[PDB]
């Protein structure tokens, strides 16, 4: 099963929204947010 890169984040839960899939969505979204904000928290923007 080759890698597929997972199109737009809510891709899964738009087909048969379940508890586990919704928890997964929340988790990955907040992980991305946390990483980006930490990188900008300490360093800042290019200018």
């Amino acid at each position: 099963p080759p890698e597929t890169k997972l199109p737009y984040p809510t891709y899964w839960s738009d087909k048969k929204a379940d508890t586990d899939t919704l928890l997964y969505e929340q988790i990955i979204q907040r992980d991305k947010i946390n990483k980006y904000s930490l990188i900008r928290e300490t360093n800042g923007y290019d200018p």
Binding site: P1, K15, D20, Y24
Partner: peptide, 21 residues
Amino acid sequence: PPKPQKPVPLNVLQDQYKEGI
């Protein structure tokens, strides 16, 4: 042709498989 499926917590997957994966 094993089409991908929606993700489940790891423990339920490795328990349903019942084989060392």
